[PDB]
């Protein structure tokens, strides 16, 4: 039958989908969510053999263990055990597109397990096995007899084993196919793996059992009263003595309880459902659930007899909350949300696609700590535990069907085809049947990147019809089709339109107001955090705050999908597309996260945290006005700390308790500002600190901050007469200056400072020269490739113009002696194919104090692409332990991504000045710096800089961080100006005009002196 | 043109049509029909089937048709004749002036139905005036109402031809048979003959 | 597989549905709706045998005519030929309500036809068979090899027979089940045949 090449057959003998069950036989255990003896985990050591095709599987395997098999842990993805290679491909399907067929060479994993079954499970009731996740399709046999088949790698497949098992030892055999017609619906941009990668369990239910239950909570106008309604269905023989009691708990207090025999109300001419019953419980003043305060109650549903005997109990956490769209706004408990979201794939660098509670908890905490309140399950239903954690820790969730057919042409070829309606329908219906009782799920999504087809409209209505409590969204086909309640584009920019044909991506501000449009707009994906990215993130936040109907978005994305590989020495390194021999592949496009695979944050995370703060501030006079953006909680775990510093030196500070109602304001008057006794700029920093620990943060947690400049006193005080006068030594090839034990040498043919000595110690390894280029970021490269150049990418514009090949031609180099100083003047032109691209004019003025003042004036031809930076660089001879500066930090920051950075005095170890992006590029810059100190050197001015052991050259020539080697000395790049990094997307130029170096003439000045 | 979907004998009537596991089978009954018949000008309205209650499968399918073929209205009587799965109020056997207020699925007088609060759809009975045996009493009352009320746009009489079958007696002479005449049981006896014309096309 | 007791399998190998085609190879014929030599009728005398259940059908029938079969006209409803009784039930299902199962004694009509196919249809192109109405489900074999299965008694089921036929004589075998999970969706108030 080749059921794996027939979308008409998505399963055989599979049981209906339902919410999480545990078949407790004690109601208190169900109330407390304790482990149930009727739910067993079969995770652990299984046997496994890999085959190149199902045709190669020996028939002996059904009956008995293959001696060639290995013992491996389950859950797992077989690629992570080394059996075959994982593939990283983005849009292009990993198999030839020829639906519904798959390759004949179809990796097959044969797993089996010998295990015990107690006669007590067989003497009565039903024993089923549940496979939470099998990628991508599989046949199941028990004790050599065929049981059933299942598809959809992201929802549980369950089968009744009652008739196949015997007391004692039994053997399961699972043949898993890497590819199936289901793979046509699983084209998401991530690693393509396979295997039994989520939990395997056995559940015993009684013959007469709860087969499903739905919990709804409806409210009155001001949420001061609610009705909990629980529809329960049973399987087994109906009997008049059967009853269902549903009780609702708030901790140990029983809030409500109702009992009834089965027999629903009349539905139509034929009657009603004799096998169901609806219990309605009234709840006064319910504690409402939200991400801000995730109040939960516990609903316990007991199936029992009239005399009181318990048959079994099921249960769930319940969160009282209403989600609705009204007048164009998405409201939660009647208040409009502002989604500080992120898309998150299920990825572990060592275990692949297998999820564990520890990693989940780690993710949730970092999210909350970073001011995220929502997560989108990009792009499939998640492991069941995820929803439990979001319900309890508090995150709004977009639950999404596992349907993505991005690689089809056109994108909706299958989704508009009624023959694929069945298969798609199961991916949506079974998800809703499983997750509908979770309060954290506030919106349903029909999948991802599958164009817009009629099947989407049919499924959209099916959901609307079965669960009116949650909006439905879907981005395919233009983000505003008839299949979505929310305009939910991916990578639409704030102000700039990208009018593509048929599926234009409008500026979000403009999209809201297109003729006749009235819906809320929440980006399903925005700001692509690939490499050094997140440039322009603040622009989104300022617009979401200004426009009521712009209700936020989900950043793309949470965590880099890099996988760990080991070198000759057994040392680990982070790998990306193509690193397993996978081809074709999409290289580093699998790494777009705010955090590295190991959960270490990238610098962009801090920018997100700051733009997504929950408190807004304004300053007027001595008055600081704090406004709360919380919808439901008071600031009861927050104190405001303020500090005033002059150029980094603290002058004063205090703390004030915050007491602001949701959406309220609090005014705080700073005490009188005693004057400072020194020139310098006073800066005010305020931070919001949580004195008490919470379920998601430690005491002392800082949740928000802001700075302002206060008074500035410009220095008008003259330096003072120098005890000495530098001497100029002129020779045919050089201009040398000596002052005390220092010497500088300016080569007359090159026109640059080629050497500087402290005593007899040389300070440079390479001369100090202008630099107009940077090792290209992912955003500069885009999709460009050696094998297929994108001439519109920034890196290609710069290459084509000769920016990386231009050589300095000297125009002038003179030296003059002034009363107290020596002055060197130089002029250079940088040319390519006879065109002048840049002209740099400078003076170096060295005085009696030993300071060398450098003034730089550059001209950039108007028709050349705007350059990546305009600065100087040099390779210093020595290496020092720390880097200390007065400027923005402490973390890496760029012109379009420096809002989170604070101006102050920072001091870090040199290695912290380099950001280890897996794909190396320009990195570690700090902007707005007025003073930088390294070893005995100090540079003063108003510049941006980066300092590290790796040259731009090396970074640009190296594709993986593990291959970089520290060069001798230290490379210092000091920029008068640096281009923004962009990131609205990473496949087209995305640096906003205001961040491009287009002025034509630029000036900067710096002083280099010894410390 | 109506999909081959009728689950009248289920209890309640929508037990299968509200069941997603039956959505696939039901989908092909609707989709394959539209795929085949959509170029015929004579088809002016699509129907989702008959007497299968109202289930979510209906809603999904109603939308599917609306999306692929906006040129024709979609109707369906199940579940009360005026659910979210029908562009037209299409009751069966609703009376002209007399309400039959059955629980959950009342059959209102047609004149009254048009004006219930919030209602604005046209009303065309999918089945009316049951011509079983000596019948059609009261037929003119429908026509007078259809002519007076703009939104009462007619109906489909139940039904055209008796489903009687020919059997032969001991002498070889033919005779008209109905339910139970073939040893079939249970059976619904003469209810299979409700037409304006006899099985041979002779008019009643 | 008992595909007739599984609402998850409504067909196997069936071709997509589409408007009426005739594959004219002359445009003027197409304009006037004239008969197309490319659209042939297989209606007429066929071979038919009735069995009480699919389990009773002999394997021999797939490869060779059953000597006991009779010759009958097709299209037809087998009740009208007297092989079993038609049933008139209005609402109550004619079979026990136990979806998706059907009775074990499930009247099975075995139809077959030996017919000619000219080489010209097989040298190029695709040759498909179209059953406009089969009540209620059936499996099809061509020259002894299984081709496919279908449900929905009121829409055409089409199969590509290209790789199954040979020039000259060929034999079709169609096993038609009276009851199937499709019966659950066919409860109209009319005779059940
Ligand atoms: O992280 C990658 C990102 O890819 C987007 O798709 C881009 C793709 O990267 C580019 O190669 C192709 O040229 O354009 C596609 C946009 O049409 C996806 O939209 C996004 O979901 C991610 O997969
Ligand atoms: O021609 C028969 C007619 O029956 C209607 O159904 C009736 C049924 O005949 C009666 O026995 C029962 O009391 O009420 C049913 C109505 O609820 C059908 O509605 C109609 O379609 C015809 O089948
Ligand atoms: Mg399949
Ligand atoms: Mg994609
Ligand atoms: Mg079937
Ligand atoms: Mg001719
Ligand atoms: Mg021959
Ligand atoms: Mg009926
Ligand atoms: Na807003
Ligand atoms: Na990606
Ligand atoms: Na407080
Ligand atoms: Na690089
Ligand atoms: Na009228
Ligand atoms: Na009748």
PDB file of N, CA and C in Angstrom, chain A residues 429 608 643:
ATOM      1  N   UNK A 429      -7.597  20.599  12.929  1.00  0.00           N
ATOM      2  CA  UNK A 429      -8.598  20.091  13.912  1.00  0.00           C
ATOM      3  C   UNK A 429      -8.008  19.384  15.085  1.00  0.00           C
ATOM      4  N   UNK A 608      16.065  44.547  22.701  1.00  0.00           N
ATOM      5  CA  UNK A 608      14.619  44.152  22.762  1.00  0.00           C
ATOM      6  C   UNK A 608      14.051  44.411  24.149  1.00  0.00           C
ATOM      7  N   UNK A 643      20.249  58.118  39.528  1.00  0.00           N
ATOM      8  CA  UNK A 643      21.637  58.437  39.760  1.00  0.00           C
ATOM      9  C   UNK A 643      22.097  59.504  38.803  1.00  0.00           C
TER      10      UNK A 643
END
